[PDB]
Scaffold this active site. Structure first.
Site, PDB file in Angstrom:
ATOM      1  N   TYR A 390       2.316 -83.872  62.273  1.00  0.00           N
ATOM      2  CA  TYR A 390       3.182 -82.763  63.330  1.00  0.00           C
ATOM      3  C   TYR A 390       3.622 -83.960  64.600  1.00  0.00           C
ATOM      4  O   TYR A 390       4.540 -83.295  65.142  1.00  0.00           O
ATOM      5  CB  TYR A 390       1.938 -82.252  63.901  1.00  0.00           C
ATOM      6  CG  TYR A 390       1.409 -81.211  62.835  1.00  0.00           C
ATOM      7  CD1 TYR A 390       2.177 -80.377  62.305  1.00  0.00           C
ATOM      8  CD2 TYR A 390       0.300 -81.629  62.018  1.00  0.00           C
ATOM      9  CE1 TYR A 390       1.942 -79.455  61.130  1.00  0.00           C
ATOM     10  CE2 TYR A 390       0.106 -80.828  60.895  1.00  0.00           C
ATOM     11  CZ  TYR A 390       0.861 -79.797  60.519  1.00  0.00           C
ATOM     12  OH  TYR A 390       0.532 -79.181  59.235  1.00  0.00           O
TER      13      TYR A 390
HETATM   14  C1  TP7 Z   1       2.833 -84.106  70.295  1.00  0.00           C
HETATM   15  C2  TP7 Z   1       4.116 -84.214  70.964  1.00  0.00           C
HETATM   16  O1  TP7 Z   1       5.115 -84.961  69.888  1.00  0.00           O
HETATM   17  P1  TP7 Z   1       5.386 -86.292  70.127  1.00  0.00           P
HETATM   18  O2  TP7 Z   1       3.924 -86.995  70.096  1.00  0.00           O
HETATM   19  O3  TP7 Z   1       5.761 -86.549  71.547  1.00  0.00           O
HETATM   20  O4  TP7 Z   1       6.134 -86.736  69.311  1.00  0.00           O
HETATM   21  C3  TP7 Z   1       4.801 -82.787  71.160  1.00  0.00           C
HETATM   22  N1  TP7 Z   1       4.664 -82.239  69.840  1.00  0.00           N
HETATM   23  C4  TP7 Z   1       3.613 -80.916  69.606  1.00  0.00           C
HETATM   24  O5  TP7 Z   1       2.897 -80.638  70.545  1.00  0.00           O
HETATM   25  C5  TP7 Z   1       3.838 -80.277  68.148  1.00  0.00           C
HETATM   26  C6  TP7 Z   1       3.118 -79.121  68.487  1.00  0.00           C
HETATM   27  C7  TP7 Z   1       3.179 -78.200  66.925  1.00  0.00           C
HETATM   28  C8  TP7 Z   1       2.523 -78.869  65.754  1.00  0.00           C
HETATM   29  C9  TP7 Z   1       0.898 -78.701  65.771  1.00  0.00           C
HETATM   30  C10 TP7 Z   1       0.634 -77.390  65.403  1.00  0.00           C
HETATM   31  S1  TP7 Z   1      -1.321 -77.458  65.454  1.00  0.00           S
HETATM   32  C11 TP7 Z   1       6.108 -82.891  71.387  1.00  0.00           C
HETATM   33  O6  TP7 Z   1       7.160 -82.586  70.840  1.00  0.00           O
HETATM   34  O7  TP7 Z   1       6.558 -83.347  72.718  1.00  0.00           O
END
Ligand code: TP7
Ligand code: TP7
Ligand code: UUT
Ligand code: COM
Ligand code: CL
Ligand code: CL
Ligand code: CL
Ligand code: CL
Ligand code: CL
Ligand code: K
Ligand code: MN
Lengths: 466, 265, 593, 466
Positions: A390
């Site tokens: 994710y």
């Molecule tokens: C963690 C973080 O991603 P990065 O580690 O920064 O790539 C963040 N994404 C998320 O929180 C994905 C949430 C959805 C997937 C999990 C569902 S349980 C974001 O895009 O800023």
């Protein structure tokens, strides 16, 4: 009121550095070494002269595989550039130039220092490193404290470098954008000096998760690189950056101040030798042996006591000092990572230790774990986002400003720093990959590389104030 | 006090510009408008109607002690607290006696207490109501208003660049002007509203008369800013407006590279 | 020594684009007004009024009503002009069927388009151009392959890469691979989503399944392929396009996240990695952060955006996504020589439409007009075309050289700009029908500035100097006409007379890396696309295959794209004919309609 | 090297404040009063006790017409809340509470100060204002300098208020989110303390256009309110904030430093009485009379000379001192706004004066206007975006961080401050509407309200160091 309770500060060899230190004297609002650490992060940048020179020479400006092409062989391309081929093709050179920046690093450093200096006695520093490829810059407090922002070292150094290069080589008008790009990268199309050649330990000032988070937006890999993998120095640097950050967030206040100060002292500064003693007792074992050592030490020191024995014989424990119990769990948490990830010499299980040391503590005692939910919560989130599709990444790319790991109030990132310090090279995105220049350049600053003794000595200097 | 030169004036076109913008040069009155017709055309207030206010009279608002403000006497509209009202005019591309940037320069040289916007298709002037009325006497009654090429229009303003109609009149989508018995007359006010009686502006000028008084360069009549033999030619061989343009570009470029580069240039 | 103006006689079909608007000689300064029946002269607006009546009856709220136009004057008191797409009669290639339309017959004109046919709101070719940009995710795969070989312990080969790409093409839009009882997307909704790769290593390229390959050797002429392959080297880059429908539910920032999920899964499934192994996080981190090329960078708070918004796309990335640089028209269109003008005038078309209609309008402002007539003017009726070629003809004769070869001195820039400004003004002054066609001063001012910059950029190869010529047109225009453009047009023109060769903090930056977040450019129509074209043409003229990023250039050399990035003026015309089938529609899952 | 050239600093009454001042001594990097101005903006906040009390009492928390409803008359609503109406409806009260915060302001101020203070006598201040409705808070330099950010006064004050209210009234667990909301508003769902009751003169630290812009993200209306409409003091405050901002942006360096310092001195500090003299000469006239006065003064002082006389008699002028010429145009520009907008007592034409004063200057002289394009460029953008459908607003809502008006290097916002000071109430988004509390509370700080004399006195104290 002052945090007058006395602690002893121990080094990473388990021997005392300073005795009878009031807790007040290690706090970021008092301790001169802690405050100097913040000041050095604010005021220090690196200029990558080798990188600026290469960008100008080849046209590989900025990042993302950008290339502004100059074509020196236009008449060999099989093209006609004149209708009917009236005139043969002639090459031009319009996006690139060769400047001897690295060869001239010493004179450039002198010119840079003069442009940055406000007054002769002001402490501005410019040092030539890496055979002229890198300058280390520390602006004066006078300059840095002119306005309200922490970015002045970054912005003044980029402009001073650009101006002094334009002047020194008496460059023509065409060069202005290109020399600017060599230092600033894609700024101002990007807020960041993206792909530029002036580097700060701090992130761009657009990137906070909230007010006061700047000292938290520092990857564990940067911390490990700057402390050259010496486990408890990495822990101390991370914990101290977190401690400064939590002051700036407003959370080292009022009825929470002692709790927050004890996290820093006990987990980050080996107060009373608890971290070292726990690793020594349990180091030949497993996470659970650290659980046993932590509960035993809390009992020995009077922090917890038996509250009630249930009919099965299971005992609920009570916290006689709730904030100190929390801090002992935080100390046990870093010890548990050292034992578990240290045995494997592999960082990845840090997220599991964060979750299950805390879970085991609660099942063992009937008392709440570190942060009343945050320790297990971040064990969960960090485990998930270091082993799934994710988002996230390997342990060393997390920080106190990363959405996955920000929640814990100062006691999570230091265990990541410990685990990554102990790792034998199992990662692709390890400190060498993400933080090599940071470690090589800023790790030469003694206070960054070896904060423990500096903080203890500074605390001893002010101990009689409280 | 220093004596302004305003702009380079090496030919009829640019001398016409200098006359418009130089506040020491009286603009000749070429038509008379009754007070009723004048106010009807503007369309903000009719004859005998009280001025509306946006704020109380200046003497009642409690201005702070302020030595700088003392040096600047308020206009009569400012003293009264009049609302700030807008009038809009449009000058055709076809040989007008005033054009859009010359309006801005003229307004800032001749009228106190102004706001003003220049656009390709219109020019706004925004002033305290009574002050605006005084300014509009110059805008509507003098040699800078040819009835067929300089028209009053508060919106739906297209026409500056449209072809002239069969009578030589600039297009108005709302038809506030019409040519009647050889005269230009406003059959609607500047807002496109009905008027009780049309407002006679009198006769328009012929094309050769417009050309004698115009501020615009036009290639078709033989007077472009840049002639065929001017690009890259030495300054001494081109119009003074092009000499000026070149200088401004060189000095903005060099000065914004390093300010000292333009010392003595 | 100047040929008959292209706006009076197109080169091959001999159409008079300006006369066609009126049925009258455009040299005559005479017109009748108030005789056209208002909007009844327009097919689209008349049809719209009838549709509006049905809509009002169905929904119970009135909508379009031309009789609301102020003070009893319907729109259309003058001619509501039609438009001809510039240059289509001079094309001879690009006749392939595309995903959006059957093959265009090269050389066929598109004339008689109404203004509303070229409104971004009404034109799916324009919308799809932007969607194709923003749904694109680009990554190097080297680190993912390194993680698999060292951390996991499995060899990467052409065979495993082929399986990976087959799996990624199954899951990027539609399917699942590893899990039981998992929901999936209707393939009809996502048939525009797929993933490919490219490499500079010809032996590797030949070993891969060609269905998954962007073939640099096939797409580019040899000199350009050589340049691009030299930069790519012995590396593999992935180019993935997520569903158009998906970005239309969210933003272009979805793309790197979405490909992070699906590429990670394709690695797990092609290499048999346990579910929850720590290596997994290296894949998503590589795709989102570690080895990634974005079309656009993030924007600051007032105009906050994640990656892959139009406002974050550097001018030179707009230049390099355009594919006119690899067309026969651009390679041999000047009597066998390269034609950087063709590159400029094509690249500026999405440059202008996407930055001004797609971004300034459809993100920062908006409303029902799309500001369409402002921008239609830069790609219709051969007007800008004539003026730009005029400067090239003038310069080639004066300096006795080819494109890209006039010395890049400030004096030479000013000379060319003075002549192109002069020519632009001569034509607007001598043709009242042309002055009325381009009735807004902004159109006329941007056009002389764009033509000047096009000529300087094409003739010197220097993109900053070409764009310097744009700003020098400010006094040349203002001191002639005594009017410029709309109220706020000349912010950037005035200041970039000084900023172009400044190095102050937020002033200096090469044109390639400027964009809609360069503060001077952040607000106003009629400029950025011109700069984009000039950047592309300057690089073309000096013998380069791209201006700014070879990865971007290669990544858009892909016939499976919904929009034809080689021939954007044509594509926008096809959308104007309602003949462009976009991606992202939801027909498969909605009632008969 | 030091900017040793001597200027005289004049007050807004046209009388000298201090003579023989080296330009160096007014710069933000040296002048103690300029530096204290930045420090006070960084360290001061206001607590709206009346607003917090009202939010808790009525449920009108935060902004946007939010209302958490408590329903005290449930049995009068005509509804049944039990199947078949078995049990009559009973009202509850679960989102609101009455706390006497305003009546208890003095004790609250004491508890707040104790939580914020780091050491006795450290300079922490809390002042009760508006009969208890507002507290003025200034944190110590000790606290403010702990980390790297400027937001510490905001964050610590919000948490300290929340903690002390929870403690003082011994509130139950239900109150924690509500009392937090009373001070923080929608934080942390918003980065801002949106709709809260702790107010800073600075914007949220997410909101910069680039690094170093924080001192630029201050609306002209705030400046005018804080200086209570005294025209040249508003100009001086705006110009000095811009001068600090341009240091922090990195643009007061190297070959640009003198140019940038002269903008501040000449436009902002009435250096050599130029601004006052130009207004005095031309005040009974129009913008163009200020053009004449400016060119005449530049000639009188030797800044420009005739370069060439064209055959028509038109004369090109040359700048003997380009940076001083630029600064004189900037001084003339503020004088022109004062004359033009002052005559109308209406701010809206400021944008037109900004454009056409500069355009007239160029046509009059053949020399470049202020900022080589930026003065006219921002005249264009600001005019457009204060009279069109697209964005923007009335003059007072612009700032050095607003996208419309940021570009000019320090000489645009001060003329907005002048025009808004002179306005007779022609706006609906005037200082009273956007900045009333700011003016009432922060305008009591003498340095903010009346910076000119403080800057001049501080310059005289250090003049012998250069
Ligand atoms: C963690 C973080 O991603 P990065 O580690 O920064 O790539 C963040 N994404 C998320 O929180 C994905 C949430 C959805 C997937 C999990 C569902 S349980 C974001 O895009 O800023
Ligand atoms: C000015 C600013 O708007 P605000 O003043 O902040 O409301 C800005 N909009 C724009 O720049 C609109 C640009 C498009 C309209 C003008 C086209 S010439 C923005 O949304 O941040
Ligand atoms: C403003 C002045 O006329 C500009 O002069 C240039 C034409 C020549 O100057 C350059 C070549 C050397 O500064
Ligand atoms: O009239 S304005 O120039 O403000 C807007 C033109 S679309
Ligand atoms: Cl940065
Ligand atoms: Cl406690
Ligand atoms: Cl009357
Ligand atoms: Cl806030
Ligand atoms: Cl200087
Ligand atoms: K293929
Ligand atoms: Mn359908």
């Amino acid at each position: 009121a002052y945090l007058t309770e006395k602690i002893d500060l121990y080094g990473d060899n388990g021997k005392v550095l300073e005795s009878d230190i009031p807790l007040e004297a290690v706090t970021p609002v008092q301790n001169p070494a802690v405050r100097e650490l913040a000041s050095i992060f604010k005021r220090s940048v690196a200029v990558n002269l080798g990188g600026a020179q290469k960008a100008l020479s080849t046209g590989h400006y900025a990042n993302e595989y950008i290339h502004f092409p100059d074509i020196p062989n236009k008449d060999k391309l099989g093209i006609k550039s004149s209708p009917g081929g009236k005139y043969p093709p002639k090459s031009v050179k319009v996006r690139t130039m060769d400047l001897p920046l690295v060869d001239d690093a010493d004179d450039i450093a002198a010119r840079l220092k003069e442009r940055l200096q406000v007054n002769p006695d002001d402490g501005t520093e410019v040092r030539v490193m890496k055979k002229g490829n890198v300058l280390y810059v520390k602006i004066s407090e006078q300059l840095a404290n002119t306005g309200v922002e922490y970015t002045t070292a970054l912005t003044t150094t980029a402009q001073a470098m650009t101006d002094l290069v334009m002047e020194k080589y008496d460059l023509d008008f065409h060069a202005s954008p290109l020399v600017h790009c060599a230092f600033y990268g894609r700024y101002p199309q990007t807020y960041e000096f993206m792909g530029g050649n002036v580097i700060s330990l701090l992130a761009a000032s657009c990137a906070n998760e909230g007010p006061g988070f700047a000292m938290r937006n520092i990857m564990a890999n940067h911390i490990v690189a700057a402390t050259r993998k010496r486990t408890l120095e990495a822990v101390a640097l991370s914990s101290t950056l977190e401690a400064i950050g939590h002051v700036e967030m407003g959370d080292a206040i009022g009825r929470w101040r002692r709790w927050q100060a004890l996290v820093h002292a006990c987990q980050g500064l080996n107060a009373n030798n608890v971290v070292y003693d726990l690793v020594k007792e349990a180091g030949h074992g497993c996470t659970g042996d650290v659980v046993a050592a932590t509960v035993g030490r809390a009992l020995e020191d009077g922090i917890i006591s038996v509250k009630k024995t249930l009919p099965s014989g299971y005992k609920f424990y009570t916290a006689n000092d709730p904030s100190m119990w929390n801090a002992y769990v935080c100390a046990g948490l870093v010890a548990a990572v050292i034992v578990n990830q240290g045995a494997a010499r592999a960082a990845q299980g840090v997220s599991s230790t964060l979750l299950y040391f805390n879970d085991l503590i609660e099942h063992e005692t009937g008392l709440p774990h570190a942060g009343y939910g945050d320790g297990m919560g971040n064990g969960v989130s960090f485990s998930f986002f270091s082993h799934a599709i994710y988002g996230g990444g390997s342990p060393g790319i997390f920080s106190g400003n990363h959405i996955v790991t920000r929640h814990s109030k100062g006691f999570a990132i230091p265990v990541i720093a410990a685990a990554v310090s102990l790792d034998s090279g199992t990662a692709v995105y390890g400190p060498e990959a993400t933080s090599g220049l940071v470690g090589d350049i800023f790790g030469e600053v003694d206070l960054i590389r070896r904060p423990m003794e500096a903080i203890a000595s500074a605390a001893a200097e002010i101990k009689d104030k409280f | 006090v220093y004596q302004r030169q305003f702009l380079p004036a090496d030919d009829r076109v640019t001398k016409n510009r200098k006359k418009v913008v130089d506040p020491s040069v009286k603009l000749e009155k070429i038509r008379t408008l009754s007070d009723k017709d004048f106010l009807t055309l503007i369309g903000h207030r009719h004859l005998g109607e009280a001025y509306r206010s946006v704020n109380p009279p200046l003497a009642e608002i409690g201005e702070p002690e302020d030595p700088i403000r003392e040096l600047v006497p308020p206009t009569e509209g400012a003293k009264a607290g009049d609302r700030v009202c807008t009038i809009i005019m449009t000058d055709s591309v076809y040989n007008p006696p005033i054009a859009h940037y010359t309006r801005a320069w003229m307004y800032h040289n001749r009228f106190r207490g102004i706001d003003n916007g220049v656009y390709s298709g219109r020019v706004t002037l925004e002033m305290r109501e009574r002050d605006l009325e005084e300014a509009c006497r110059t805008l509507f009654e003098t040699e800078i208003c040819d009835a067929s090429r300089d028209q009053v229009r508060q919106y739906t303003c297209t026409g500056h660049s449209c072809r002239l109609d069969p009578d030589g009149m600039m297009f108005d989508p709302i038809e506030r002007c019409i040519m009647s018995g050889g005269n230009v007359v406003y059959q609607k006010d500047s807002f496109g509203n009905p008027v009780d009686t049309p407002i006679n502006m009198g006769k328009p000028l012929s094309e050769e008369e417009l050309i004698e008084r115009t501020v615009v360069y036009r290639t078709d009549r033989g007077e472009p800013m840049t002639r065929e033999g001017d690009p890259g030619a030495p300054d001494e061989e081109v119009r003074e407006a092009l000499q000026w343009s070149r200088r401004i570009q060189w000095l903005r470029m060099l000065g914004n590279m390093v300010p000292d580069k333009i010392k003595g240039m | 020594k100047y040929p008959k103006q292209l706006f009076l006689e197109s080169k091959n079909s001999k159409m008079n684009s300006i006369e066609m608007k009126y049925g009258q000689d455009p040299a005559i300064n005479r017109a009748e007004f108030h005789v056209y029946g208002g909007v009844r002269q327009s097919k689209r607006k008349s049809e719209a009024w009838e549709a509006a009546k049905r809509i009002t009856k169905e929904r119970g709220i009135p909508n379009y009503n031309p009789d609301l136009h102020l003070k009893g004057a319907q729109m259309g008191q003058k001619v509501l002009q039609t438009y001809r797409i510039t240059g289509l009669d001079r094309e001879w290639a690009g006749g392939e069927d595309t995903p959006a339309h059957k093959g265009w017959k090269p050389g066929t004109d598109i004339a008689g388009l109404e203004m509303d046919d070229l409104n971004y709101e009404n034109n799916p070719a324009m919308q799809q151009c932007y969607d194709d940009m923003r749904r694109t995710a680009i990554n190097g795969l080297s680190i993912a392959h390194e993680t698999i070989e060292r951390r996991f312990g499995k060899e990467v080969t052409p065979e495993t890469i082929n399986l990976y790409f087959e799996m990624l093409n199954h899951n990027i839009g539609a399917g699942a691979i590893m899990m039981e009882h998992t929901a999936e997307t209707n393939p009809e909704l996502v048939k525009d989503s797929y993933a490919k790769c490219f490499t500079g290593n010809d032996e590797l390229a030949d070993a891969l399944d060609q269905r998954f390959l962007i073939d640099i050797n096939k797409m580019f002429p040899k000199y350009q392929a050589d340049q691009i392959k030299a930069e790519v080297g012995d590396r593999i880059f992935q180019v993935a396009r997520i569903p158009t429908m998906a970005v239309r539910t969210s933003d272009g920032g979805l793309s790197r996240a979405w490909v992070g999920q699906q590429a990670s899964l394709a690695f797990l499934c092609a290499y048999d990695i346990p579910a929850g192994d720590a290596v997994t996080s290296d894949f998503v981190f590589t795709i989102k952060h570690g080895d990634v090329v974005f079309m656009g960078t993030q924007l600051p708070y007032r105009r906050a955006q994640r990656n892959n918004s139009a406002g974050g796309i550097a001018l030179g990335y707009y230049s390099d996504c355009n594919q006119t640089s690899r067309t026969p028209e651009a390679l041999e269109g000047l009597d066998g020589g390269i034609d950087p003008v063709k590159v400029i005038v094509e690249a500026l078309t999405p440059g202008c439409v996407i930055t001004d209609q797609g971004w300034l309008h459809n993100y920062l402002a908006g409303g029902s007009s799309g500001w369409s007539n402002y921008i239609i003017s830069v790609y219709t009726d051969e007007v800008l075309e004539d003026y730009g070629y005029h400067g090239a003809i003038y310069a080639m004769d004066k300096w006795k050289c080819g494109v890209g070869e006039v010395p890049n001195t400030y004096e030479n820039m000013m000379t060319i700009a003075e002549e192109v400004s002069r020519w632009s003004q001569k034509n607007y002054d001598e043709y009242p029908g042309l002055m009325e066609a381009h009735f807004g001063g902004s159109q006329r001012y941007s056009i002389q500035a764009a033509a000047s910059g096009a000529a300087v950029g094409a003739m010197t190869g220097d993109p900053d100097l070409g764009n310097a010529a744009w700003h020098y047109n400010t006094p040349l225009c203002k001191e002639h006409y005594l009017r410029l453009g709309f109220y706020g047009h000349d912010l950037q023109d005035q200041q970039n007379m000084g900023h172009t060769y400044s190095y102050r903090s937020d002033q200096g930056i090469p044109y390639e890396l400027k964009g809609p977040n360069y503060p001077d450019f952040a607000m106003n129509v009629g400029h950025m696309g011109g700069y984009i074209g000039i950047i592309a043409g300057a690089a073309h003229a000096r013998g380069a295959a791209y201006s700014t990023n070879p990865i971007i250039k290669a990544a858009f050399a892909d016939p499976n794209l919904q929009f034809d990035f080689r021939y954007p003026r044509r594509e926008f015309g096809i959308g104007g004919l309602r003949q462009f089938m976009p991606a992202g529609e939801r027909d498969a899952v909605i009632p008969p309609h």
